[PDB]
Amino acid sequence: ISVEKIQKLAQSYQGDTRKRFTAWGNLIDSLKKKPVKIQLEKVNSFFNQFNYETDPITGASDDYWKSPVEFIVDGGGDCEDFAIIKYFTLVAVGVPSDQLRITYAASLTLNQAHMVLSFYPTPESEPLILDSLESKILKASARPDLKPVYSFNAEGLWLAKTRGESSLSLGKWDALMKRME
Ligand SMILES: [Ca+2]
């Protein structure tokens, strides 16, 4: 997306919302051309300042992927929603989309399903985990509390243990894209 788009978007709001729009946009403009490690840490940290919404029913995620704009307006979301805006923010600052996957994992600690953002330095690499419930950005192997089940992005779906090529984009991803237009 564009930081000029967000500038536009910021005008159509006020209060603790238009400045979250400008804070968000400044960030993207700030992180352009910056080292990946800086980008990952600052984006992760920026959004982990947002509100963590727990679904009053499931006690976790609901069934609705919030668009980033919605995440900004609502001032937050659940673990899937966190992974989503981090994904798009990082793509905006120039991280190649194919280095980023939204990951559905079994959590041993929370004893339930938990979504994270996985960043892959190189294609064969074990990913770094950008969690909404952990400030540390750690390698997969340093997150034994997490056992991935599947991952996805704009380019496919990977069943855990799938190396390289997509296991197949989800229809649910498509619908989110359409919602973001
Ligand atoms: Ca959600």
Coordinates of all heavy atoms in Angstrom, one line a residue, residues 61-66 77-81, ligand 1:
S61 N -9.3 -16.4 18.9 CA -9.6 -15.8 17.6 C -11.1 -15.9 17.3 O -11.7 -16.8 17.8 CB -8.7 -16.5 16.6 OG -7.4 -16.6 17.0
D62 N -11.6 -15.0 16.6 CA -12.9 -15.1 16.0 C -12.7 -15.7 14.6 O -11.6 -16.1 14.2 CB -13.8 -13.9 16.0 CG -13.1 -12.8 15.2 OD1 -12.2 -13.1 14.4 OD2 -13.5 -11.6 15.2
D63 N -13.8 -15.6 13.8 CA -13.7 -16.2 12.4 C -13.5 -15.1 11.3 O -13.7 -15.3 10.1 CB -14.9 -17.0 12.1 CG -14.9 -18.3 13.0 OD1 -13.8 -18.9 13.3 OD2 -16.0 -18.6 13.5
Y64 N -13.0 -13.9 11.7 CA -13.0 -12.7 10.8 C -11.7 -12.0 10.7 O -11.3 -11.3 11.6 CB -14.1 -11.8 11.3 CG -14.1 -10.4 10.6 CD1 -14.8 -10.4 9.3 CD2 -13.6 -9.3 11.1 CE1 -14.8 -9.2 8.7 CE2 -13.6 -8.1 10.4 CZ -14.3 -8.0 9.2 OH -14.4 -6.8 8.5
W65 N -11.0 -12.2 9.6 CA -9.7 -11.5 9.5 C -9.9 -10.0 9.3 O -10.4 -9.5 8.3 CB -9.0 -12.1 8.3 CG -8.5 -13.5 8.5 CD1 -8.5 -14.2 9.7 CD2 -8.0 -14.4 7.5 NE1 -8.1 -15.5 9.5 CE2 -7.7 -15.7 8.2 CE3 -7.8 -14.3 6.1 CZ2 -7.2 -16.8 7.5 CZ3 -7.3 -15.4 5.4 CH2 -7.0 -16.6 6.1
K66 N -9.5 -9.2 10.4 CA -9.6 -7.7 10.3 C -8.6 -7.2 9.2 O -7.5 -7.6 9.1 CB -9.2 -7.0 11.6 CG -10.4 -6.8 12.5 CD -10.0 -5.7 13.5 CE -10.6 -5.9 14.9 NZ -10.4 -7.3 15.3
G77 N -7.1 -5.9 17.6 CA -7.7 -7.1 17.2 C -7.2 -8.4 17.9 O -6.6 -8.3 18.9
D78 N -7.4 -9.6 17.3 CA -6.9 -10.8 17.9 C -5.7 -11.3 17.2 O -5.1 -10.7 16.3 CB -8.0 -11.9 18.0 CG -8.6 -12.3 16.7 OD1 -7.8 -12.4 15.7 OD2 -9.8 -12.6 16.6
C79 N -5.2 -12.5 17.7 CA -3.8 -12.9 17.2 C -3.7 -13.0 15.7 O -2.7 -12.7 15.1 CB -3.4 -14.2 17.9 SG -4.5 -15.6 17.5
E80 N -4.8 -13.5 15.0 CA -4.8 -13.5 13.6 C -4.7 -12.1 13.0 O -4.0 -11.8 12.1 CB -6.1 -14.2 13.0 CG -6.7 -15.2 13.9 CD -8.0 -15.7 13.4 OE1 -9.0 -14.9 13.5 OE2 -8.1 -16.9 13.0
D81 N -5.5 -11.2 13.6 CA -5.5 -9.8 13.1 C -4.2 -9.1 13.3 O -3.8 -8.4 12.4 CB -6.6 -9.0 13.9 CG -7.9 -9.6 13.8 OD1 -8.3 -10.1 12.6 OD2 -8.6 -9.6 14.8
Ligands
CA1 CA -10.0 -11.9 13.9

